[PDB]
Amino acid sequence: PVVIKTEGPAWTPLEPKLITRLADTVRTKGLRSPITMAEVEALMSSPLLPHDVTNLMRVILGPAPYALWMDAWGVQLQTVIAAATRDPRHPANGQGRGERTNLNRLKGLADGMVGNPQGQAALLRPGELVAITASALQAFREVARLAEPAGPWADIMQGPSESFVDFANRLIKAVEGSDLPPSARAPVIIDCFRQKSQPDIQQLIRTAPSTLTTPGEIIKYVLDRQKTA
Amino acid sequence: PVVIKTEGPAWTPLEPKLITRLADTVRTKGLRSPITMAEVEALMSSPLLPHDVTNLMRVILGPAPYALWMDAWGVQLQTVIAAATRDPRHPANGQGRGERTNLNRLKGLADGMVGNPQGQAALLRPGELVAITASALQAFREVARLAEPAGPWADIMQGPSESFVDFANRLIKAVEGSDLPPSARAPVIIDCFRQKSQPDIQQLIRTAPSTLTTPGEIIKYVLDRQKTA
Amino acid sequence: PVVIKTEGPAWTPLEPKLITRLADTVRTKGLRSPITMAEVEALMSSPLLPHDVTNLMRVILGPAPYALWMDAWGVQLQTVIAAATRDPRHPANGQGRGERTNLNRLKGLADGMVGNPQGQAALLRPGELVAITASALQAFREVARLAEPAGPWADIMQGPSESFVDFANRLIKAVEGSDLPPSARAPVIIDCFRQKSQPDIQQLIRTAPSTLTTPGEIIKYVLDRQKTA
Amino acid sequence: PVVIKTEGPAWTPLEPKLITRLADTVRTKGLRSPITMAEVEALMSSPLLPHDVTNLMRVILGPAPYALWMDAWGVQLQTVIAAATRDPRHPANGQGRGERTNLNRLKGLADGMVGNPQGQAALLRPGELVAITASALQAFREVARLAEPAGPWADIMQGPSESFVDFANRLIKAVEGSDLPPSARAPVIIDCFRQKSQPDIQQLIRTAPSTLTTPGEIIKYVLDRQKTA
């Protein structure tokens, strides 16, 4: 993090207490939990310098996820630089050709920046910072989606002893965290409620005097009329 | 069937040979096979009188499907009569109120028609005949879809000894003959190819150097690179 | 949360630290514990924008409870809008017909609000905010009461090894969290103390020289004269 | 099928009796038998409209072979359209640029053709029809060769109880329906007769006072001098 003061942009590091809490969050909840992504968005609020994001991912991520994240961050930054050479009005670019932003300046590899966060904060633009930050966030999302797969939705059955809300949670999780289009999730969730969800609940849904046309309505109906046991 | 000659509309019955062949087709292939529906469409080519369709369904259908079909035919004819009272320009209706078509005239129950196909062919309109015929076809479709369910798609697995084309046929049949929207069948078929289809073919599809984005392409790829055994 | 400043209503997000603590509270204590409802009331203190409440319930609730909560919130907001069209003096409404509040404006679906919390905070009324907040709280209460049933009170027995205060806690919980009228809980709790609560305590309550006419008095008496073991 | 009459090209459907017989032929004999290909050539005699061929393949082929056939038909039609843009003298094309034939017109997807066979027969050219028909025939051949592989020729042995004419039939089938060049089939068939075909017939062929230089001559010799049993 940088503070743009009168003397110039002064760099302030992130608290190691927040970083330790975020690292333990990633350690217990995993990379893909919505609470973890919310915490990352929180610590991704102010535009960070390449040094900050690099050290942050070095600390919170293990070695192999860190390698994957470096790869993904490079790819996303390259897409950004292609869009930048496709539009001279990038908030990282300038009007003349002398302000064109090279990947050495984005990854912090340019002259006067390697290993020095103060000089980094000096030469970098705010548009550069926000582009780097958005790129790093998208790369984190990619790596998180890659490190742990969503479980195959079509293999999910309600166990003989499992409750129905746990089964519904697991199924909705695996269906929404999958490769289906957004407009195909609700019908699939409904038809999986009807064919999975062991034959007692199957018959309970089948003999519904009303027509249930939404996963929430099916869940409410089943929770009302379920066999207390 | 009727022939509209100079003396007047003369009724000609359908051949009992064609009816016997159609009955045996329904007996061996079932009610829902595409060949059976094609044969029914064939014998549903000329506009039939209520007597013809009623006797045809009496002969080709069993007792319980015949009861179901009578119910469905009545419901569809009632929808037709509601649309007819909602539009005085029905090809079964006339311009004045004296030509309004009652359900007794559609079901063949009106005066001068009960049990007599000749009088039926005399008083009926061609628009009446085509409306009755379309109603009977839709009712047959409903009863055929009702008598035998499509198998639940989410419970289909490729057996240890089953070939892949049989599994693909069964899966595509159960997915297309189900309650899914038309725009959700291809993604579901693909994701069921990937998660069902026992782990040898699962790994064969997983390690595809190209991206397969269509059930036909997946089928072609698997048929090319399958383990001959 | 919004701050109504001189430039205009500026939106401030809730702390992810408080949200993480509340999510872990819901994870360990459940949805129905009085501590959880107190914490929700705490984080429901300032009038929240639809964006805030929606994201809050997305984070703290699982997928299936979140679907149930969306349903219940919609129903409660519809009741609010019916009361609003039944009274033109709603703090969300205005005096003329041009200020009537549609459900698109309450759920945050209206024009200039979809996905943008700043514009949301701009166009929304404080009465709108408090109505949305009360609706969301009532919906949370409904879903919490629905997700986990109170245990059937008439099936509660004091175990052979269970202490009496645990049995009394369980019984009072199940009786007060049930479908009985408020004026029928004390007599039922007393008569369940007398007939459940294995025969040693049954005889201890039976041979009470004084008449015990309150669950608290029965609990005090039994705790005084109980067989220390 | 279309009849080009004085009023204009009138469409006549194929008989459902012939289609049912062809479907049962495909069901019993398979896709690759020479009798099946002859029957398809028979029903592929008059130039068919895209509607006719599409419905024909929908009826005679299962779901997965139908998907494969749609793919192959599209590819072959694309090759045809490439040849058409490579030669302005295509019987489907015209002399000016306004008669160039797009794939929407070949697949029946163009304007005034979607779902309507009468309009289809109206706007289509006879060269268009014959090109579509030849493309569909080649696609059927590809899919038939793909759905069922020829058995590996180099793994064919004459069983201990199998007769010699059955072994010769199986071997010639697998060798001619394989990936060998046409000029390499006879020597391979001969050398497989000599090394397979269990040692009694091996010695019978070895001790041939004449030199046998053709599979037919070897078959005749073995049938003459075989051990009757």
DSSP string, B53-99: HHHHHHHHS-HHHHHHHHHHHHHHHHHHHHHHHT-TT-TTS-SSGGG
Chain B segment 27-46 residues within 8 A of D by beta carbon are 34-35, 38-39, 41-42
Burial class (CB in 10 A: 0-12, 13-18, 19+), C195: exposed
Tokens of A179: 């490769």
Q: How far is CA B4 from CA A75, B85, B118, in A?
A: 76, 28, 12
Taking the alpha carbons of B3, B8, B11, B12 in that order, is the dihedral positive or negative?
negative
Specify the 3-state DSSP secondary structure of B143.
helix
Using the Cβ of C155 and the Cβ atoms of chain A, whether some distance falls under 8 Å is answered with no
CB atoms within 10 A of CB D43: 19
In Å, what resolution does this model reach? 3.1
Using the Cβ of B168 and the Cβ atoms of chain D, whether some distance falls under 8 Å is answered with yes
Instruction: Give me the CATH number covering residue D215.
Output: 1.10.1200.30
Interface test with A, best of B157, B176, B188 (most A CBs within 10 A): B188
Are the beta carbons of C67 and A172 separated by less than 8 Å?
A: yes
Enter the DSSP assignment of C136. Answer: H
Nearest to A181 among B179, B187, B192 (CB): B187
Closest CA relative to residue D175, chosen from D164, D184, D166, D163: D184
Q: Which residues of D116-142 are buried (b: 16+ CB within 10 A; e: fewer)?
A: ebebbbeebbebbbebbbebbbbbbbb
d(CA D163, CA C216): 98
| Closest CA–CA distance from residue C102 to any residue of chain A (Å) | 23
Are the beta carbons of B180 and A187 separated by less than 8 Å?
A: yes
Residues of C in contact with A39 (CB under 8 A): 16, 20
Using the Cβ of A18 and the Cβ atoms of chain C, whether some distance falls under 8 Å is answered with no
**Helices and strands, number each (H, E), in chain B:** 11, 2
Cβ-contact B212, B205 below 8 angstroms: yes
Strand D2-4 relative to strand C9-11, pairing: unpaired
Cβ-contact B108, B49 below 8 angstroms: yes
Using the Cβ of A219 and the Cβ atoms of chain C, whether some distance falls under 8 Å is answered with yes
Are the beta carbons of A187 and B181 separated by less than 8 Å?
A: yes
Q: Which residues of C18-33 are buried (b: 16+ CB within 10 A; e: fewer)?
A: ebbebbebbeeeebbe
A and D touching (3 or more beta-carbon pairs closer than 8 Å): no
Using the Cβ of B169 and the Cβ atoms of chain D, whether some distance falls under 8 Å is answered with yes
d(CA D64, CA B169): 5
d(CA D144, CA D137): 11
Using the Cβ of C64 and the Cβ atoms of chain A, whether some distance falls under 8 Å is answered with yes
Using the Cβ of B209 and the Cβ atoms of chain A, whether some distance falls under 8 Å is answered with no
Q: How far is CA D56 from CA B33, C52, D10, D28, D119, in A?
A: 15, 58, 19, 17, 19
Backbone angles phi, psi at C11, to 5 degrees: -90, 130
Residue where the block lists tokens 């049954």: C202
> In degrees to the nearest 10, what's the CA dihedral of B15, B21, B23, B29?
-150
Half-sphere exposure of C1 (CA within 13 A, CB side): 11
> Is residue C122 within a helix (H) or strand (E), and if so which, with residue range?
helix C117-123
Distant-in-sequence, close-in-space partners of B69: CB < 8 Å, separation ≥ 6: B57, B61, B139, B140, B143
d(CA D191, CA B11): 71
Q: Mark whether D62 and D94 lie in a shared domain.
A: yes
Q: Mark whether A56 and A164 lie in a shared domain.
A: no
For A154, name the nearest residue in chain B, comparing CA atoms only. Answer: B154
End of a domain among D147, D167, D201? D147
Distant-in-sequence, close-in-space partners of C36: CB < 8 Å, separation ≥ 6: C25, C26, C29, C30, C144
Are the beta carbons of A165 and C146 separated by less than 8 Å?
A: no
Using the Cβ of A183 and the Cβ atoms of chain B, whether some distance falls under 8 Å is answered with yes
Residues of B in contact with D23 (CB under 8 A): 35
Residue type, B10: A
Strand D2-4 relative to strand D9-11, pairing: antiparallel
Q: Mark whether D173 and D203 lie in a shared domain.
A: yes
Burial class (CB in 10 A: 0-12, 13-18, 19+), B4: exposed
Closest CA relative to residue A153, chosen from A141, A139, A171, A137: A171
End of a domain among D112, D130, D147? D147
Nearest to B35 among D59, D63, D65 (CB): D59
Q: How far is CA D98 from CA D35, D82, D113, D192, D228, in A?
A: 42, 17, 18, 58, 73
Residues of B in contact with D68 (CB under 8 A): 216, 219-220, 223
> In degrees to the nearest 10, what's the CA dihedral of D162, D163, D165, D166?
-20
| Closest CA–CA distance from residue B40 to any residue of chain D (Å) | 10
Structure-determination approach: cryo-EM
Q: Mark whether C128 and C201 lie in a shared domain.
A: no
d(CA A82, CA A102): 10
Residues of A in contact with C52 (CB under 8 A): none
**How many domains in chain A?**
2
Q: Mark whether A161 and A140 lie in a shared domain.
A: no
Q: Mark whether D130 and D174 lie in a shared domain.
A: no
Distant-in-sequence, close-in-space partners of D191: CB < 8 Å, separation ≥ 6: none
Are the beta carbons of B220 and D65 separated by less than 8 Å?
A: no
Are the beta carbons of A228 and C152 separated by less than 8 Å?
A: yes
Are the beta carbons of A216 and C67 separated by less than 8 Å?
A: yes
Q: Mark whether A53 and A106 lie in a shared domain.
A: yes
Cα C85 to chain centroid distance, Å, stands at 27
Cα A70 to chain centroid distance, Å, stands at 15
Tokens of B76: 């569809």
Distant-in-sequence, close-in-space partners of D185: CB < 8 Å, separation ≥ 6: D175, D176
Q: Mark whether D142 and D170 lie in a shared domain.
A: no
End of a domain among C147, C171, C203? C147
Q: Mark whether D42 and D132 lie in a shared domain.
A: yes
Task: Residue B45: give the domain boundaries.
Answer: 2-147
Residues of B in contact with D152 (CB under 8 A): 228
Q: Mark whether C103 and C71 lie in a shared domain.
A: yes
Distant-in-sequence, close-in-space partners of C30: CB < 8 Å, separation ≥ 6: C36, C148
Q: Mark whether D136 and D183 lie in a shared domain.
A: no
Tokens of C121: 């905070």
Rg (CA), chain D: 24
Instruction: Give me the CATH number covering residue B91.
Output: 1.10.375.10
For C20, name the nearest residue in chain A, comparing CA atoms only. Answer: A35
Cβ-contact D185, D160 below 8 angstroms: no
Q: How far is CA A116 from CA A7, A13, A47, A106, D30, in A?
A: 18, 13, 17, 14, 74
Q: How far is CA D140 from CA A34, B168, B219, B225, D23, in A?
A: 51, 19, 16, 20, 14
Nearest to A183 among B152, B183, B194 (CB): B183
Q: What is the 3-state secondary structure (H, E, C) of chain A?
A: CEEECCCCEEECCCCHHHHHHHHHHHHHHCCCCHHHHHHHHHHCCCCCCHHHHHHHHHHHCCHHHHHHHHHHHHHHHHHHHHHHHCCCCCCCCCCCHHHCCCHHHHCCCCCCCCCCHHHHHHHCCHHHHHHHHHHHHHHHHHHHHHHCCCCCHHHCCCCCCCCHHHHHHHHHHHHHCCCCCHHHHHHHHHHHHHHCCCHHHHHHHHCCCCCCCCHHHHHHHHHHHCCCC
| Closest CA–CA distance from residue D182 to any residue of chain B (Å) | 22
| Closest CA–CA distance from residue C89 to any residue of chain A (Å) | 33
Provide the angle, in degrees to the nearest 10, between the axes of the packed helices B164-176 and B185-195: 140
Using the Cβ of A192 and the Cβ atoms of chain B, whether some distance falls under 8 Å is answered with yes
Using the Cβ of D75 and the Cβ atoms of chain B, whether some distance falls under 8 Å is answered with no
Specify the 3-state DSSP secondary structure of D33.
coil
Q: Mark whether B9 and B115 lie in a shared domain.
A: yes
Are the beta carbons of B165 and D147 separated by less than 8 Å?
A: yes
Backbone angles phi, psi at D101, to 5 degrees: -100, 120
